Amino acid sequence: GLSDGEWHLVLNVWGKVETDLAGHGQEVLIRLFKSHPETLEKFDKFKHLKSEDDMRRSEDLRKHGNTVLTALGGILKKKGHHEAELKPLAQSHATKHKIPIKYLEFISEAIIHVLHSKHPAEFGADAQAAMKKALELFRNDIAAKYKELGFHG
Ligand code: HEM
Numbered sequence: 001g002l003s004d005g006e007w008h009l010v011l012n013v014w015g016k017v018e019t020d021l022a023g024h025g026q027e028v029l030i031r032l033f034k035s036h037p038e039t040l041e042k043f044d045k046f047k048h049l050k051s052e053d054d055m056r057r058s059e060d061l062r063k064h065g066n067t068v069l070t071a072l073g074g075i076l077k078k079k080g081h082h083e084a085e086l087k088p089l090a091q092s093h094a095t096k097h098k099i100p101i102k103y104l105e106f107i108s109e110a111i112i113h114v115l116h117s118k119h120p121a122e123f124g125a126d127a128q129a130a131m132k133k134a135l136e137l138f139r140n141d142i143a144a145k146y147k148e149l150g151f152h153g
Contacts (some may be wrong), residue, residue: 002130002137007079010130013122014076017115018069025065028111030055036106042097075138082138087103090142093148099143108135 018024033039034055040047046060055061071089075082093099112132116123146152 002133006126006130007076007134008136009113009117009127010012011038011076011079013127014072014131014134017119017122019119021066021069022062023065025067025069025072026058026062028068028107029061029064030058030112031110032107035110036103038100038103042100072138076134079148082141086141087145090145090150093142094146096132099139099146104139104142108139109134 033043040050045064046058049055049058073083075086078084109132112128112135115131117129
């Protein structure tokens, strides 16, 4: 399974493709948003904006991009337990920016494709796989947390 090697690989590749903090975060955020405008909606953060250029290269956007980029770092690293202070994020989302269904799947997917494309020319099939699979893992964890000791019912 996934294992050490796999994990490392994914992690590194990610890290490499990512490298560009600001850009990285912003791009991801924008896509997600335009991808799943549901995102736009949830965002009370920014919404005066809602167009091509606006998302393309927006102040706030970029700002969030970094935070986004940065955070994931941990989750994947632990290369055993992205549970750094991942709980924190989880709680956060639970309360405000909930893990709205497919939302995360989308995020994950988009991020995946984005990266590979950006700083290839890995795509290394095996690599692509983990990457996506990795996001999957993350997602599963967060939700379990949420439902079972976050709110749930
Ligand atoms: C891997 C995915 C995500 C990571 C690691 C993440 C992380 C962060 C972080 C570290 C914060 C700073 C405050 C807090 O914590 O909450 C933030 C805030 C926030 N995120 Fe996320 N985020 C992700 C996904 C999402 C998604 C998918 C959305 C909505 C679909 C979302 C909506 C928010 C909102 C609304 C805030 C606060 C808005 C504001 O700041 O103003 N986030 N997120």
